[PDB]
Amino acid sequence: MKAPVRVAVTGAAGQIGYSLLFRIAAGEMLGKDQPVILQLLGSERSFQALEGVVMELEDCAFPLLAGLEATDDPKVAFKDADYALLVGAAPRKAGMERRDLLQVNGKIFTEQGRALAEVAKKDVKVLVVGNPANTNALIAYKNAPGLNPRNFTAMTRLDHNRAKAQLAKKTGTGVDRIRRMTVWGNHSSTMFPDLFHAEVDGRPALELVDMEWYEKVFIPTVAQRGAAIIQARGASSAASAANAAIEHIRDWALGTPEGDWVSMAVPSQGEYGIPEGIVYSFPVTAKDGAYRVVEGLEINEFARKRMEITAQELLDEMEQVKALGLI
Amino acid sequence: MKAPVRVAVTGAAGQIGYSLLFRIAAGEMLGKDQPVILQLLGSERSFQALEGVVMELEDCAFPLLAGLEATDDPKVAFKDADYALLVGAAPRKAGMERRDLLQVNGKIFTEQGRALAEVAKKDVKVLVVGNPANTNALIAYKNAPGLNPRNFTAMTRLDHNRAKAQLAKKTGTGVDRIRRMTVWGNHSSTMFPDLFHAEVDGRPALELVDMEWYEKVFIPTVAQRGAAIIQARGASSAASAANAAIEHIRDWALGTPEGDWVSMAVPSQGEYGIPEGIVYSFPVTAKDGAYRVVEGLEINEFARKRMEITAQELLDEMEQVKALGLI
């Protein structure tokens, strides 16, 4: 009954894309009643591999996959897109410094941001996954004049889910009973997982775990989780990252649970004193495809300091890209 | 909420497993209201990676994942299992042999068949994915006396879905409008995709495509599809194979659509004159953990010829296993 929506996904032939596309086509991201048109973006280098991915999607005989098109042209992949998941980013070449990567990503997201403004739906929902996520998202929306900046977001949902998982583990409770988890700031080592407002079966988390565990165990473990996966599997967390991207888009479009909220890095508008413009992760609720930062939360010294530290790191990142003339 | 069911999966640290486990934990295989307990089996060699997969699963914060346990012991992995997906098989060390391959797989599936018979639920539903699937299934159930042999099956659902995909592409219609596809026999080069009973939008397939295309294009393309993915991606079709596995179990546990059917390789009981005992893919309808071969279908010469060829291949494999004393 519902008309198909167009979903653009970049970095489609990569690891996250391989763990992402099938579940999207299965209807897990936008609903089992919502047909999707997959517009996949790849590079000339990985286009042959992308055709391989297209074949596997076809071989799943998905009833909701109403369209499937692979391309190496952003203007084609983003054409009339209702959703755009920017997973592709600059590769980690040997002898490629931080700044070297910075300018490569600068070109990618400047180009893609401009492509989106030119050919995608004006209300296209954008999620940046490719790192550095928050800053790449900044580059994109700044280069997407004509489009709503708040429609440009970055993913901290994996950090968010990792925090919920750790809290559930420690308390010996179902993760389905963990609510109001928050990861503030940058998707980086300075991220701040907040337990001051989190609840386990309705009870304040800090009534079940102590401050020492929270500070010396919980925070570092959530921050190092990505490395833990690599050290164990010998590969990055593609499947769980894909799951996080799906939930980020899903909750944004279909809405968050009553009494709960999720983490989303979005363009700051001064909430909690966070500098404007930078893409900062905040606790947010969503409804009808729009989200709202959860304000009014009490922020103690412990939280404030960590929130400011990650905010400063983001300001610094913005400073760098701005000096490069990217924005 | 239904009582949790235990799902055992072997070769859990491999490619298909990485594409399979998350969707199962998401409830895509047994329903959104069916909690699942994942019992993962991994060899001593891949256990470190398996622990990494466990972490990623935890990091998805799946509400339906009521349990998660990794082990290298089949008797632990299969304990009280309601379902067992046998994905792990044997490699092919540089310079091996056919009769040699049967030896390694013979030990694997004899052990797992015995483990299932000893610790799994009496009505455990088993699907063999690791190749050679049909023969591995035969070895497994032969070594699981006491357990219903019909509960042991092999996967041809990927061939089935690939066939539906090709027909849909050729006729230019939605794959969702493709029904009554059948893949008979062995999951091998002798597999027989049947178009004589398939319908496209309620219309017989052979009315939209001719025998020339069927024999010269359709059959070879479906048979070579696995190689095509490898040649394009540089990796096997893990995602589409995982999807096929999920659908095989799903349509078996829940049920096939009204007026339609699916392909499942199951122990033959003489249907269509196929030798008893061998695990042969048949067109089948299913409901609540029980399936029935769709008998009474008109089988023309073109079909029987190919049905007999693949049946003979399976007989020879059975004779080989028998000569080795595996069954």
Side-chain angles (χ1 to χ4, degrees), chain B residues 116-133:
Chain B
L116 287 162
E118 190 190 315
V119 310
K121 286 291 187 63
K122 273 57 205 60
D123 197 38
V124 57
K125 304 305 178 179
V126 186
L127 161 67
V128 180
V129 173
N131 279 310

Side-chain angles (χ1 to χ4, degrees), chain B residues 55-206:
Chain B
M55 291 192 279
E56 285 211 63
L57 280 169
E58 301 182 323
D59 296 342
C60 296
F62 286 125
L64 297 173
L65 189 55
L68 180 58
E69 169 182 55
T71 180
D72 57 14
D73 188 338
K75 296 187 183 186
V76 169
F78 301 150
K79 181 177 181 53
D80 296 316
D82 295 290
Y83 302 84
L85 284 62
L86 311 191
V87 185
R92 187 185 187 183
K93 62 184 295 180
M96 189 180 260
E97 174 193 59
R98 175 65 182 181
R99 305 67 190 176
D100 182 299
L101 187 65
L102 280 47
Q103 292 290 293
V104 54
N105 283 132
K107 293 303 298 173
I108 292 176
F109 292 90
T110 49
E111 189 181 318
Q112 295 182 179
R114 294 191 309 160
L116 287 162
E118 190 190 315
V119 310
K121 286 291 187 63
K122 273 57 205 60
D123 197 38
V124 57
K125 304 305 178 179
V126 186
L127 161 67
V128 180
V129 173
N131 279 310
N134 303 60
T135 295
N136 286 334
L138 166 69
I139 295 177
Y141 90 78
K142 247 61 180 61
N143 284 286
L147 290 185
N148 179 9
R150 271 302 176 78
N151 278 338
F152 285 75
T153 67
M155 193 177 82
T156 48
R157 186 50 177 274
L158 179 56
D159 304 304
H160 177 96
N161 288 343
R162 283 167 168 170
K164 297 205 301 174
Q166 293 292 144
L167 184 58
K169 182 194 297 297
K170 178 61 175 180
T171 62
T173 63
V175 71
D176 62 301
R177 305 289 57 183
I178 299 299
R179 305 221 306 175
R180 292 175 181 171
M181 177 59 71
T182 311
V183 166
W184 307 75
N186 196 14
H187 173 65
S188 70
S189 66
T190 67
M191 58 167 280
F192 170 55
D194 190 338
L195 246 35
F196 296 112
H197 298 291
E199 303 189 314
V200 186
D201 270 297
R203 185 174 183 183
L206 290 318

Side-chain angles (χ1 to χ4, degrees), chain A:
Chain A
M1 193 166 118
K2 293 185 174 185
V5 286
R6 293 167 189 283
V7 180
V9 187
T10 71
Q15 314 174 96
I16 290 172
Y18 197 64
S19 287
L20 177 69
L21 301 180
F22 304 85
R23 292 185 65 195
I24 287 179
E28 288 208 65
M29 188 175 78
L30 306 173
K32 297 292 180 177
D33 67 338
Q34 180 63 69
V36 300
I37 300 294
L38 285 179
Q39 309 192 339
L40 316 180
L41 182 69
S43 55
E44 308 167 356
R45 176 69 165 298
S46 59
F47 192 83
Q48 180 178 308
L50 185 47
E51 309 191 275
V53 177
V54 165
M55 290 190 277
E56 288 211 66
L57 288 160
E58 297 178 328
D59 295 341
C60 287
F62 285 128
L64 295 171
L65 188 55
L68 183 55
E69 167 180 56
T71 180
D72 57 14
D73 187 342
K75 296 183 183 180
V76 173
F78 299 156
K79 178 74 178 306
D80 298 320
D82 296 292
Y83 299 87
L85 284 68
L86 309 191
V87 181
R92 215 299 158 55
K93 176 194 64 181
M96 182 176 270
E97 295 191 301
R98 176 67 173 179
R99 182 187 62 273
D100 190 300
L101 191 70
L102 201 55
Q103 295 205 59
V104 175
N105 281 314
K107 184 180 183 302
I108 296 302
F109 292 93
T110 286
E111 190 181 320
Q112 290 181 182
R114 295 191 175 301
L116 288 165
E118 189 188 314
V119 306
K121 287 292 184 63
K122 261 48 188 299
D123 196 42
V124 58
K125 276 51 175 70
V126 187
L127 162 64
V128 176
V129 172
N131 283 311
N134 304 58
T135 293
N136 282 334
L138 169 66
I139 298 300
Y141 90 75
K142 286 295 189 175
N143 280 278
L147 298 186
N148 181 189
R150 271 295 169 89
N151 280 336
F152 281 79
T153 66
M155 187 176 80
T156 44
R157 183 53 172 269
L158 177 56
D159 302 305
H160 183 274
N161 290 346
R162 280 168 173 169
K164 293 172 60 181
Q166 289 297 318
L167 181 59
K169 301 175 64 63
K170 181 61 177 180
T171 63
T173 59
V175 72
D176 64 311
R177 303 307 180 190
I178 302 303
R179 308 185 332 170
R180 300 191 161 197
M181 176 60 67
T182 307
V183 171
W184 307 79
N186 200 182
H187 169 63
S188 68
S189 66
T190 67
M191 64 175 90
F192 168 51
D194 188 352
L195 291 184
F196 295 110
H197 301 288
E199 289 172 28
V200 184
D201 250 310
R203 164 129 78 153
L206 295 176
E207 273 179 33
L208 298 175
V209 303
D210 70 302
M211 281 301 300
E212 187 170 298
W213 175 79
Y214 174 27
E215 196 189 324
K216 76 174 183 175
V217 179
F218 180 75
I219 297 184
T221 300
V222 170
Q224 187 266 340
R225 188 66 158 193
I229 306 303
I230 293 170
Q231 285 200 139
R233 296 189 57 244
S236 56
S237 57
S240 51
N243 181 67
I246 286 169
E247 292 178 2
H248 174 113
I249 293 295
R250 181 199 70 191
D251 294 346
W252 184 358
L254 305 183
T256 48
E258 178 58 47
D260 200 5
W261 63 61
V262 300
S263 300
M264 290 183 83
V266 308
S268 171
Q269 285 185 175
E271 298 90 345
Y272 293 99
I274 290 65
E276 296 189 317
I278 53 173
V279 183
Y280 194 99
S281 187
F282 290 102
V284 179
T285 63
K287 190 173 191 61
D288 296 317
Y291 59 76
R292 172 167 65 82
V293 170
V294 179
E295 301 183 68
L297 296 179
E298 175 190 354
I299 279 52
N300 59 33
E301 297 182 299
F302 183 99
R304 178 54 62 184
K305 214 313 172 64
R306 287 172 176 278
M307 284 165 71
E308 302 188 323
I309 287 178
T310 190
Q312 185 58 56
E313 177 182 55
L314 282 168
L315 287 176
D316 291 352
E317 278 179 33
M318 176 181 75
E319 165 184 292
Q320 299 172 56
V321 303
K322 193 162 71 66
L324 294 173
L326 292 174
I327 63 179

Side-chain angles (χ1 to χ4, degrees), chain B residues 1-321:
Chain B
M1 282 292 108
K2 311 174 66 183
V5 292
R6 293 162 193 282
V7 182
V9 184
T10 70
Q15 312 170 76
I16 288 178
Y18 197 65
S19 287
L20 176 64
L21 307 181
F22 304 82
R23 294 187 64 200
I24 291 179
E28 296 221 273
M29 187 175 81
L30 304 176
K32 251 57 179 176
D33 60 353
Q34 175 62 77
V36 296
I37 290 172
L38 287 178
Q39 294 177 180
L40 316 178
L41 178 69
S43 69
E44 180 185 301
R45 185 183 184 181
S46 62
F47 199 74
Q48 179 178 180
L50 186 49
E51 294 186 302
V53 176
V54 167
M55 291 192 279
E56 285 211 63
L57 280 169
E58 301 182 323
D59 296 342
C60 296
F62 286 125
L64 297 173
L65 189 55
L68 180 58
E69 169 182 55
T71 180
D72 57 14
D73 188 338
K75 296 187 183 186
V76 169
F78 301 150
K79 181 177 181 53
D80 296 316
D82 295 290
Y83 302 84
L85 284 62
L86 311 191
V87 185
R92 187 185 187 183
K93 62 184 295 180
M96 189 180 260
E97 174 193 59
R98 175 65 182 181
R99 305 67 190 176
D100 182 299
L101 187 65
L102 280 47
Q103 292 290 293
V104 54
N105 283 132
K107 293 303 298 173
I108 292 176
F109 292 90
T110 49
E111 189 181 318
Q112 295 182 179
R114 294 191 309 160
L116 287 162
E118 190 190 315
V119 310
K121 286 291 187 63
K122 273 57 205 60
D123 197 38
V124 57
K125 304 305 178 179
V126 186
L127 161 67
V128 180
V129 173
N131 279 310
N134 303 60
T135 295
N136 286 334
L138 166 69
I139 295 177
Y141 90 78
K142 247 61 180 61
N143 284 286
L147 290 185
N148 179 9
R150 271 302 176 78
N151 278 338
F152 285 75
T153 67
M155 193 177 82
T156 48
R157 186 50 177 274
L158 179 56
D159 304 304
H160 177 96
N161 288 343
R162 283 167 168 170
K164 297 205 301 174
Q166 293 292 144
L167 184 58
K169 182 194 297 297
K170 178 61 175 180
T171 62
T173 63
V175 71
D176 62 301
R177 305 289 57 183
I178 299 299
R179 305 221 306 175
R180 292 175 181 171
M181 177 59 71
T182 311
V183 166
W184 307 75
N186 196 14
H187 173 65
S188 70
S189 66
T190 67
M191 58 167 280
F192 170 55
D194 190 338
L195 246 35
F196 296 112
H197 298 291
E199 303 189 314
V200 186
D201 270 297
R203 185 174 183 183
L206 290 318
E207 268 184 38
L208 304 178
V209 301
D210 51 54
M211 289 304 290
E212 194 185 308
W213 176 79
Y214 183 8
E215 170 173 49
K216 320 317 296 186
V217 181
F218 183 69
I219 294 176
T221 297
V222 175
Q224 189 269 331
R225 191 66 162 190
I229 294 180
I230 292 172
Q231 287 206 139
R233 297 189 55 239
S236 57
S237 60
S240 51
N243 179 75
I246 288 170
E247 299 186 347
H248 177 293
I249 291 295
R250 183 196 70 193
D251 298 342
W252 179 9
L254 304 183
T256 48
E258 182 63 39
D260 193 6
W261 66 61
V262 300
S263 299
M264 291 180 77
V266 309
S268 174
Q269 285 180 176
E271 298 93 334
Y272 291 101
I274 284 64
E276 292 185 299
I278 57 178
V279 181
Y280 192 101
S281 184
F282 288 107
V284 305
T285 60
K287 292 172 63 63
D288 316 304
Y291 59 75
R292 296 188 173 185
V293 171
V294 177
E295 301 185 69
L297 294 177
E298 190 72 62
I299 276 56
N300 65 52
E301 60 311 297
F302 186 103
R304 49 182 49 200
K305 171 59 186 173
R306 289 163 178 282
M307 287 167 70
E308 291 302 307
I309 289 173
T310 189
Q312 186 52 55
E313 181 183 57
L314 285 168
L315 271 182
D316 300 323
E317 282 180 45
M318 175 178 259
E319 298 176 65
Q320 295 182 58
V321 173

